[PDB]
Design an enzyme around this catalytic site. Structure first.
Site, short mmCIF file in Angstrom:
data_model
loop_
_atom_site.label_atom_id
_atom_site.label_comp_id
_atom_site.label_asym_id
_atom_site.label_seq_id
_atom_site.Cartn_x
_atom_site.Cartn_y
_atom_site.Cartn_z
N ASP A 1 -1.57 -7.42 1.65
CA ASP A 1 -1.06 -6.10 1.29
C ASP A 1 0.47 -6.06 1.39
O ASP A 1 1.04 -5.31 2.19
CB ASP A 1 -1.71 -5.03 2.18
CG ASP A 1 -1.29 -3.61 1.81
OD1 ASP A 1 -1.68 -2.69 2.54
OD2 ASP A 1 -0.61 -3.42 0.78
N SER B 1 3.85 3.95 8.13
CA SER B 1 3.68 2.52 7.88
C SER B 1 4.93 1.92 7.25
O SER B 1 5.76 2.61 6.67
CB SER B 1 2.48 2.26 6.98
OG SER B 1 2.33 0.88 6.69
N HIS C 1 0.80 -1.21 0.00
CA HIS C 1 0.00 0.00 0.00
C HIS C 1 0.84 1.27 0.00
O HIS C 1 0.27 2.37 0.04
CB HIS C 1 -0.94 0.01 1.21
CG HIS C 1 -0.26 0.33 2.50
ND1 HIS C 1 -0.13 1.61 2.98
CD2 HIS C 1 0.32 -0.48 3.42
CE1 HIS C 1 0.51 1.58 4.14
NE2 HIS C 1 0.79 0.33 4.43
#
Lengths: 151, 97, 45
Positions: free
Chosen positions: A51, A103, A29
């Site tokens: 992901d 992230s 992502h």
């Protein structure tokens, strides 16, 4: 510690990718390419249920690969943004400790072994839980605390 | 119409276009199922119109249509195996989270 | 012609479904850092 690689779409760092065991992975992502030209050119395998994009580390980085472990007891784990509490089968931190855009950060145990990679978090009451991926020795699983916002 | 008496046998003449003639005959409201394999004639051209009706799209093929059934069954079995594998994998992925 | 086309299309569909099932089965194993896979799955792949 050598589990830090930059990903750029606007020229800025958007997410992190790492070296573990015998493979490289990054969250799928995060938009952009790996800073290391040697790693960005590889053929990546891409899965949206978890992901994640993964490939095999070249041989010459045998010293760069970090250890990994599936066992995960109750208690405290360490990462770049302080420390996290894993309890009740779930990773948490207190409210507002994380912020969006971070992230790709792995979570380490007291020995420096990677046990999870954060993708997001969701705040309930005074504590915010983490939507991450972790691994039974068999398969990569994802834990989401009834929904969380992406980083 | 035929003349019948006692226990005996009667002969009828019929025409068809079917390679495998499977039909039923009614005599005095009694039905008999006749089946036979028919062979093509050797004379190419005749001077009289066909006494039988043409075969359409439903009452078609011969008794050796079992090749069609076998090939359809084999391909359907392969498709069923693939679909079963896909269903198993999809169920495993849906159950896993 | 239509029968051969239909049979080939069904064969291709079966091959595609089998490839999709195989990729979905293999994806969870190519993302775990431990290089562990059941030998039966290895024989399948």
């Amino acid at each position: 510690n050598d589990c830090i690689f930059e990903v750029k779409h606007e020229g800025k760092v958007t997410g992190y990718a790492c070296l573990v065991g015998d493979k490289v992975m990054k969250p799928a992502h995060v938009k952009g390419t790996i800073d290391n030209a040697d790693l960005a050119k590889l053929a990546f395998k891409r899965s949206s249920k978890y992901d994640l994009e993964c490939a095999q580390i070249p041989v010459h980085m045998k010293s760069d690969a970090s250890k990994f472990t599936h066992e995960k007891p109750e208690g405290y784990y360490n990462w770049h943004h302080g420390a996290v509490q894993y309890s009740g089968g779930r990773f948490t931190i207190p409210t507002g400790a994380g912020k969006p855009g971070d992230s790709g950060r792995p979570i380490f145990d007291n020995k420096g072994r990677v046990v999870a990679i954060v993708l997001g978090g969701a705040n309930e009451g005074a504590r915010t839980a983490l939507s991450v991926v972790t691994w039974n020795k068999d398969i990569v699983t994802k834990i989401t605390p009834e929904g969380a916002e992406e980083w | 119409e035929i003349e019948v008496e006692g226990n005996s046998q009667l002969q009828i003449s019929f025409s068809t276009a079917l390679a495998s003639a499977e039909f039923r005959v009614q005599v005095c409201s009694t039905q008999v199922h006749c089946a036979a394999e028919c062979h093509p004639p050797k004379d190419h051209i005749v001077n009289y119109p066909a006494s039988h009706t043409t075969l359409g799209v439903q009452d078609i093929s011969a008794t050796a249509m079992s090749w069609v059934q076998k090939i359809t069954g084999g391909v359907g079995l392969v498709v069923a195996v693939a679909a079963l594998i896909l269903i198993v994998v999809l169920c495993v992925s849906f159950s896993r989270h | 012609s239509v029968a051969s086309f239909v049979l080939l299309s069904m064969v291709g569909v079966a091959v595609g479904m089998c490839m999709c099932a195989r990729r979905r089965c293999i994806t969870p194993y190519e993302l775990t850092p431990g290089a562990t896979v059941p030998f039966l799955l290895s024989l399948i792949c």
